[PDB]
Design a protein around this ligand. Structure first.
Ligand SMILES: *[C@@H]1O[C@H](CO)[C@@H](O[C@@H]2O[C@H](CO)[C@@H](O[C@@H]3O[C@H](CO)[C@@H](O)[C@H](O)[C@@H]3O)[C@H](O)[C@H]2NC(C)=O)[C@H](O)[C@H]1NC(C)=O
Ligand SMILES: *[C@@H]1O[C@H](CO)[C@@H](O[C@@H]2O[C@H](CO)[C@@H](O[C@@H]3O[C@H](CO)[C@@H](O)[C@H](O)[C@@H]3O)[C@H](O)[C@H]2NC(C)=O)[C@H](O)[C@H]1NC(C)=O
Ligand SMILES: *[C@@H]1O[C@H](CO)[C@@H](O[C@@H]2O[C@H](CO)[C@@H](O[C@@H]3O[C@H](CO)[C@@H](O)[C@H](O)[C@@H]3O)[C@H](O)[C@H]2NC(C)=O)[C@H](O)[C@H]1NC(C)=O
Ligand SMILES: *[C@@H]1O[C@H](CO)[C@@H](O[C@@H]2O[C@H](CO)[C@@H](O)[C@H](O)[C@H]2NC(C)=O)[C@H](O)[C@H]1NC(C)=O
Lengths: 288, 528, 48, 672
């Protein structure tokens, strides 16, 4: 996986084609049916019983595990259609960050046919409601940090990393994670500003890929310092079955996540999650 | 054997289905271009009558079609049409629909090897196997032409390779016609060697020029040349052997052979000459260009071994054609070329084509292309080296492809043996310096006290094109390092293993500056 | 003997197709076929 | 860099750069004649430039720095030179004032470096394909020996000097004043990165990299002036590592390494696959021998047809002056002609000549006979070469699998996609090819272009089925088209096609699976299957396909292929007029595709057997008057969708399916 700032035209073109192929499908592995995993309608914890909830673990000792499983499931679904490489990730932590111009447009010209076409990144249609997600803009992300300073998001990241045990790092990690959600969602009804329709906008996967990257650099820093990075204060919380990823087929067509529903073997992402990262770079300054 | 030979070339065929039409008619085929240009390739007849019992063949009928397509240039993989015309006995045109439309078939090469039969002449026997009858017949049938001063005289014949020059244009003689360096060398020299058999036969030859296996241990020059003069009383005049000297119609002098001590050096077992290992090394590799660049110096050696230090001998390219040992050796050269094809057949890698000299193959072939210089109608239409690989088309053969009195089976066994272990090589660059020279090299380690590693050979006159070999000529020094007791790993070792001291000696005894030639390099070859 | 079975439920007479034949091929067990050596004998002929 | 260039002593940037030119201590300072140690054309050139970069990094580290020298990526296309060097004077708000850039120019012995950019750098490559520099550097990787790598590596290296310098002596175009512009360090760092890619790929291949086996004689010699005592070079690590047997393991030695080994977004295995695919097909080379002419100059190539004019074929560039050791490359130097060969559609073995013209930087024409006879050679493709050991190739995109083990998720996905295809209705239009309606004409009568009973039969069905499955995957099915096996005895009809109806969780509702039947467009009727009571528990299909596969030639194979193809078609068609029996309509059912998939499979199997046996397989020996002309329905452009159906329509092209169509199979096993 690579950041979206080192992708040329052809990769964007292939990715757009794959996304449209995913989108127009109306299958059990359809885009809507996989966005179902992170929002309404409610099917959590046991869809057979009466209680209605969303299995999106929020503010608990399993958030990184759950969202990493989600992103790897999305990667597995996408790579079938022809994705040569991993999903790109957008670095909102970049100073003077802006909305990704790859997605900020609405329509673009396919040069192979020399004709205009609707860009999937612009919006996606909510299936049952029959509506679409509309983004919103605010100047907070696009503010220019001054000469030699650091931005609010960057210092937030630093004040998230200085801690030396997982058992509390996650709380500030989450509270800073929620910020770009509303920052990109704005006051629009349907957007990432609320979890009611969180997954119905493609930027979601980019944002959480960046999340997983930060969690990985957390592990790298901790192993450099020589401390136990395993979430040992959740020993009775990890062993819970991460529904709906732990159900039975055909509800979970993919099998890798189903077999890895135990978080105890998810720390080593370089081996058992069939993906990796090009660089551990953070703000032009490495882990050493 | 004739039909086996015919099957070798590929064929294009028109395939038909035939039946009974209860009448008789004349059928004519018509091959037509896409642009409606039709040619009548052939015709035949169909026989039947009202009283016959209806019939049809269970298989195809084939008609040869290659002639018209190859004459008009329409290749097999092109597009065209085939049409059938029927003419009745009673002068009535007939419907072509009565016959099905035909098909086109392609019979490919037959890479199998055929043991051809030829008359017991134009079969180049080994020199030692010759008997008294053959020897006397050859010497008489060569002196007869040697004493001819006409246009077909031996001096005019040998003027091609040597001097006086007649190239690149016969009208203005600039430089010699000898073709060297470029890969077409074996082609030019093999065809030149063949060229004299026509003259010999037409002047009374009995067998073709024998090949001398210098790879076998050599006590000295064979007695055929070593002889001086013999008496037979048929003309009541002693005959001097024409296999020692040669008249020059220009210089009024004669060549003088000279042996060299190293020519008598023997191998470890003593059943092969010192050049046997180099011969196997030449045979070893696969690509044709690498083969020829490794193979030129091989025959270049003997010229210096036997030409001595004389301006008029085999040591100089200007006058080397004026001594029959030239022909004797180039016969064995062609032997090596031919025996390479049998080794090629094992992996079946393409050999007839030259993937590395596509521009060079189709080049106009001097000087036989123009009828002015030679008037042998058989070779007047062979200015393409591409049509020279299939030497069976050139109407000769060899008694056996054996080398060193041994079979290709033991050849490949020895190649495998020499490939088993590791090797260390010396790679020399080489290019024309307008003279002939010796490259003597000695491997010396840190001590500075060393042995004589070996020597290689280079030739070039003063009226030849400039030329540089494509790749690096490789020589074996692994055994010499073994007597020096330096393991091949020591070359890689961080210790200073050794180096080499090379030098070049001119023919007349002078020594050219070492700057005239590049810096030799050390190569390593792992085990397989 | 040859009969024609159709999808309609009917037959067709065998005369529409050419009568077939029977073919037998021996096994590929053959190893050597060519003669070890020919005979090199000269034969004379009349001049005419 | 400001501090380093202001410095003048033995720690000075000026001296560390003057290493590469005048004044001279080469070969040894104690010699009546002195040259430069810029080993150009030698076998130690990468070693020397790696040492230079290491020395530069060590020297700059002492001026308050953290990381290594960034490498400018000239391989990746750009529209403008980097802005880090574009500016001449920039405003720093740390002092709140502008001041001149330290990259725009470099003051050396009373003069400054000068830049003269040329527009030929700013070409915009056409979409899909790389640029000239990219392909030149790319063709230096497949060669498994550093011995041949070095020449292409250095030619790519010195291309940029003429590309960007211009025609000024006081510039980096000439070797004399090329080590003083700052960007030279950046460029050589990037070239070192290219070499690092080389040995990474070498390690991937498994062959040794840190011990070359070509020029050990010269490689034993220590380098100068990187080995004299510290009085000439302040630092010590380079001096101690002067001997070049150790500048390979950079990560173990000098404690530094890159991060992005990717080249134009290509991973190492991905570019390995790409270069193998490129090598698959045959090609042509121009071959040169190179030696100094004391004047660095460009060389242009043009092919002159004896039966026609002469045309140019691009150009490359070489370095050379009067103050360097003479060099002679050991072997030939390659240049590409394939693009112009395709453009001029001249045959691969036609009669022509290639002529080289040498032009100085100014534009003067030096004599065009300074390099001997330039050669031209031809290289056969990987398919053409044979090793008689399997095939050993992996493809991407489509991977067709046996549906009997396909899991239910993708099964539901693909049936849903097919239902959507029936919904939009273009399925009828695409399937109308194989039979009625009359999408074809012959003998002045509405007919069908259903190719049957000829050698081009398997070709036409393979192309048709692949086009149909591509149109299906346009609906984003989870997997590609599967194949229904029948070689193993069938206990009953396959589950996916005989199951009554499906139950989708999206609506949590039942619906009838389309695989039973489909309404033929505007006909008033629907299809209907009819199984036959002798389709089960028989080895007749197995033994028939075996005795069809036993054959050797191709035309004979074709006829038994067609026979067994129509066999099970008629068997399963049954009495039904509108079924798999009558081919006028039989292509309207998904069983058609599920059958033709294995129809193609057995052809691929026969291809594999022919490859193993060594007989000619790709080339055919029948219908030679037709094999050039592509299939009739696919010749046109309006009906056919795009790409393969309009370009790779040649029956001669059809054979190379694994490369020109990019779809493999799950396995080549044939009934265990
Ligand atoms: C996913 O499915 C949707 C269908 O809802 C696809 O959108 C439609 O795609 C087709 C291509 O198969 C477009 O047809 C083309 O339209 C252009 C413009 O009129 C025309 O020039 C072409 O000849 C062709 O007919 C169609 O226009 C398009 N729908 C709209 C409203 O534009 C979408 O392409 C699919 N995504 C994929 C395959 O990745
Ligand atoms: C000159 O020779 C040709 C070839 O032998 C004769 O052509 C023959 O012509 C007769 C009648 O003109 C054809 O008879 C036809 O037979 C079919 C049944 O097969 C019948 O249905 C027709 O009504 C007609 O009677 C005969 O087929 C044809 N020969 C061939 C081989 O087709 C021609 O008649 C001869 N000229 C004269 C003046 O007889
Ligand atoms: C013995 O052989 C050597 C070469 O193997 C001969 O040396 C060649 O000829 C001359 C010396 O005789 C030298 O080159 C010539 O120099 C003159 C000087 O004016 C020049 O005009 C000629 O054009 C030619 O370049 C050199 O040593 C060598 N020629 C080369 C290498 O091209 C030598 O002459 C022979 N011995 C005798 C006694 O002839
Ligand atoms: C057998 O099937 C054939 C195929 O249609 C039928 O043959 C055709 O029948 C029609 C009318 O019955 C005729 O006009 C055609 O001339 C026939 N053609 C041929 C080639 O036979 C036939 O009807 C079917 N058998 C039965 C008993 O109906």
């Amino acid at each position: 996986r690579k950041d979206v700032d080192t992708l040329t035209d052809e990769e964007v073109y292939e990715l757009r084609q794959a996304l449209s192929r995913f989108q127009n499908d109306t299958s059990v592995n359809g885009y809507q049916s996989v966005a179902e995993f992170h929002g309404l309608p409610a099917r959590c914890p046991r869809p057979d019983a009466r209680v209605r909830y969303a299995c999106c673990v929020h503010g608990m000792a399993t958030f990184p595990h759950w969202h990493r499983l989600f992103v790897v499931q999305v990667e597995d679904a996408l790579k079938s259609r022809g994705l040569h490489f991993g999903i790109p990730y957008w670095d909102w932590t970049r100073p003077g960050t802006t909305v990704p111009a790859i997605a900020s447009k609405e329509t673009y010209v396919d040069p192979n046919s020399g004709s205009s076409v609707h860009n999937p990144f612009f919006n996606a249609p909510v299936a049952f409601l029959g509506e679409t997600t509309s983004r919103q803009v605010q100047p907070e992300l696009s503010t220019k940090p001054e000469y030699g300073d650091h931005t609010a998001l960057f210092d937030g990241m630093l004040l998230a990393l200085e801690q030396r045990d997982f058992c509390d790092f996650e709380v500030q990690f989450e509270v800073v994670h929620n910020l770009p959600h509303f920052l990109v969602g704005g006051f629009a009804s349907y957007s990432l500003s609320t979890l009611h329709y969180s997954a119905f906008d493609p930027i979601f996967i980019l944002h959480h890929s960046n999340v997983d990257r930060l969690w990985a650099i957390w592990q790298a820093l901790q192993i450099k310092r020589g401390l136990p990075y395993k979430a040992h204060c959740a020993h009775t919380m990890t062993h819970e079955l991460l529904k709906p990823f732990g159900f039975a087929p055909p509800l979970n067509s993919n099998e890798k996540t189903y077999s890895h529903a135990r978080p105890t073997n998810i720390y080593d992402y370089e081996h058992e999650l069939e993906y990796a990262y090009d660089n551990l770079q953070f703000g032009g300054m490495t882990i050493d | 054997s004739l039909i086996n030979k015919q099957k070798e070339k590929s064929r294009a065929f028109a395939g038909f289905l035939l039946g009974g039409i209860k009448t008789s008619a004349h059928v004519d085929i018509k091959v037509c271009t896409p642009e409606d240009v039709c040619k009548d390739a052939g015709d035949f007849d169909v026989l039947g009558g009202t009283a016959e019992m209806p019939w049809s063949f269970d298989r195809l009928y084939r008609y040869e079609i290659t002639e018209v397509l190859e004459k008009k240039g329409l290749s097999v993989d092109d597009a065209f049409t085939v049409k059938v015309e029927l003419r009745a006995l009673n002068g009535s045109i007939l419907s072509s629909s009565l016959i099905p439309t035909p098909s086109v078939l392609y019979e490919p090469k037959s890479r199998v090897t055929s043991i051809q039969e030829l008359p017991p002449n134009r079969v180049r026997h080994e020199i030692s196997h010759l008997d008294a009858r053959a020897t006397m017949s050859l010497k008489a049938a060569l002196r007869d032409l040697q004493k001819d001063g006409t246009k077909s005289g031996w001096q005019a014949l040998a003027a091609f390779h040597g001097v006086p020059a007649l190239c690149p244009s016969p009208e203005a003689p600039k430089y010699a016609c000898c073709l060297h360096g470029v890969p077409t060398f074996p082609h030019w020299h093999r065809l030149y060697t063949l060229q004299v058999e026509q003259a010999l036969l037409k002047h009374g030859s009995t067998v073709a020029l024998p090949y001398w296996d210098w790879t076998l241990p050599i006590s000295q020059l064979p007695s055929l040349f070593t002889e001086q003069t013999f008496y037979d009383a048929w003309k009541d005049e002693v005959l001097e052997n024409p296999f020692a000297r040669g008249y020059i119609k220009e210089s009024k002098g004669y060549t003088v052979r000279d042996p060299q001590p190293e020519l008598f050096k023997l191998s470890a077992d003593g059943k092969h000459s010192v050049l046997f290992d180099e011969v196997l090394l030449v045979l070893e590799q696969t690509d044709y260009c690498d083969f020829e660049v490794q193979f030129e110096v091989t025959h270049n050696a003997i010229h210096y071994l036997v030409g001595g230090h004389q301006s008029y001998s085999l040591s100089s390219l200007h006058y080397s054609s004026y001594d029959p040992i030239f022909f004797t050796h180039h016969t064995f050269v062609d032997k090596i070329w031919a025996v390479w094809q049998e080794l090629q057949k094992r992996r079946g890698l393409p050999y007839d084509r030259a993937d590395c000299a596509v521009n060079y193959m189709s080049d106009a072939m001097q000087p036989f292309n123009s009828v002015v210089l030679n008037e042998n109608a058989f070779t007047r239409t062979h200015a393409l080296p591409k049509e020279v690989f299939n030497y069976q088309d050139l109407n000769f053969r060899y008694d056996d492809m054996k080398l060193g009195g041994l079979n290709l089976d033991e050849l490949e066994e020895e190649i495998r043996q020499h490939q088993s272990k590791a090797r260390v090589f010396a790679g020399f660059l080489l290019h024309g310096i307008g003279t002939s020279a010796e490259v003597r090299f000695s491997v010396c380690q840190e001590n500075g006290k060393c042995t004589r590693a070996g020597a290689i050979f280079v030739l070039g006159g003063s009226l030849e094109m400039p030329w540089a070999f494509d790749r690096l000529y490789k020589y074996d020094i692994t055994d010499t390092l073994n007597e020096l007791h330096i393991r091949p790993e020591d070359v890689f070792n961080a210790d200073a293993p050794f180096s080499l001291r090379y030098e070049i000696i001119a023919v007349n005894g002078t020594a050219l500056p070492p700057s005239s030639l590049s810096k030799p390099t050390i190569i390593f070859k792992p085990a397989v | 003997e040859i009969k024609i079975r159709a999808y309609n439920g009917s037959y067709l007479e065998s005369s529409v197709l050419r009568r077939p034949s029977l073919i037998f091929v021996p096994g590929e067990d053959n190893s050597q076929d060519q003669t070890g050596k020919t005979e090199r004998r000269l034969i004379r002929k009349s001049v005419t | 860099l400001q501090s380093l260039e202001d410095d003048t002593s033995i720690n000075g940037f000026e001296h560390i750069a003057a290493f590469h030119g005048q004044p001279n201590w080469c070969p040894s300072p104690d010699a009546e004649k002195k040259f430069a140690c810029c080993a150009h054309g030698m076998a130690v050139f990468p070693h020397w430039h790696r040492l230079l970069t290491v020395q530069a990094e060590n020297a700059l580290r002492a001026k308050g720095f953290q990381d290594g020298l960034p490498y400018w990526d000239w391989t990746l296309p750009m529209t403008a030179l980097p802005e880090i060097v574009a500016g001449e004077t920039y405003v720093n708000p740390e002092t709140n004032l502008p001041e001149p850039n330290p990259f725009h120019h470099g003051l050396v012995e009373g003069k400054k470096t000068t830049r003269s950019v040329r527009d030929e750098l700013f070409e915009k490559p056409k979409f899909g394909r790389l640029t000239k520099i990219a392909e030149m550097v790319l063709l230096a990787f497949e060669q498994t020996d550093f011995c041949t790598f070095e020449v292409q590596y250095e030619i790519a290296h010195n291309y940029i000097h003429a590309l960007v310098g211009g025609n000024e002596s006081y510039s980096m175009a000439s070797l004399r004043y090329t080590a003083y512009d700052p960007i030279f360090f950046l460029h050589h760092s990037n070239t070192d990165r290219i070499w690092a890619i080389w040995q990474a790929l070498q390690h991937y291949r498994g062959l040794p990299y840190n011990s070359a086996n070509c020029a050990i004689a010269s490689l034993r010699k220590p380098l100068q002036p990187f080995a004299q005592t510290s009085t000439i070079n302040p630092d010590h690590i380079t001096r101690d590592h002067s001997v070049p047997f150790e500048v390979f393991d950079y990560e173990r030695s000098f404690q530094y390494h890159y991060d992005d080994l990717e080249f134009n977004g290509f991973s190492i295995p991905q570019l390995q696959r790409e270069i193998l695919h490129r090598q698959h097909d045959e090609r042509v080379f121009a071959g040169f021998m190179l030696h100094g002419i004391r004047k660095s100059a460009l060389v242009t190539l043009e092919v002159c047809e004896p039966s026609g004019p002469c045309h140019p074929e691009g150009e490359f560039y070489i370095l050379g002056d009067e103050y360097e050791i003479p060099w002679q490359y050991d072997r030939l130097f390659q240049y590409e002609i394939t693009d112009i060969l395709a453009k001029y559609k001249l045959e691969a073995n036609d009669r022509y000549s290639v002529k080289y013209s040498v032009i100085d930087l100014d534009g003067k024409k030096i004599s065009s006979e300074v390099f001997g006879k330039v050669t031209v050679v031809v290289r056969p493709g990987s398919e053409t070469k044979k090793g008689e050991i399997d095939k050993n190739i992996v493809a991407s995109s489509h991977i067709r699998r046996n549906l009997q083990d396909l899991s239910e998720g993708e099964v539901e996905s693909l049936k849903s996609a097919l239902r959507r295809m029936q919904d939009d209705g273009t399925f009828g239009k695409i399937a109308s090819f194989h039979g009625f309606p009359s999408l074809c004409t012959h003998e002045g009568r509405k007919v069908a272009c259903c190719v049957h009973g000829s050698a081009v039969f398997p070709h036409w069905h393979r192309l048709y089925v692949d086009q149909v499955e591509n149109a299906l995957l346009a609906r984003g099915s989870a997997v590609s088209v599967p194949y229904w096996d029948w070689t193993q005895p069938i206990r009953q009809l396959p589950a996916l096609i005989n199951e009554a109806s499906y139950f989708d969780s999206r609506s949590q509702t039942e619906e009838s699976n389309p695989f039973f039947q489909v309404k033929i467009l505007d006909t008033g009727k629907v299809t209907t299957r009819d199984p036959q009571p002798e389709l089960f528990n028989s080895d007749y299909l197995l033994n028939n396909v075996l005795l069809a596969l036993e054959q050797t030639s191709f035309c004979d194979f074709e006829i038994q292929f067609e026979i067994v193809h129509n066999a099970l078609h008629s068997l399963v068609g049954g009495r039904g007029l509108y079924s798999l029996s009558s081919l006028d309509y039989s292509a309207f059912d998904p069983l058609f595709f599920l059958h033709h998939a294995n129809v193609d499979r057995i052809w691929a199997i026969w291809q594999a057997l022919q490859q193993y046996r060594g007989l000619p397989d790709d080339k055919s020996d029948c219908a030679l008057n037709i094999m050039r002309q592509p299939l009739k329905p696919f010749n046109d452009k309006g009906q056919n969708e795009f790409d393969l159906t309009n370009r790779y329509s040649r029956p001669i092209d059809v054979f190379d399916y694994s490369n020109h169509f990019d779809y493999h199979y799950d396995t080549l096993n044939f009934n265990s």
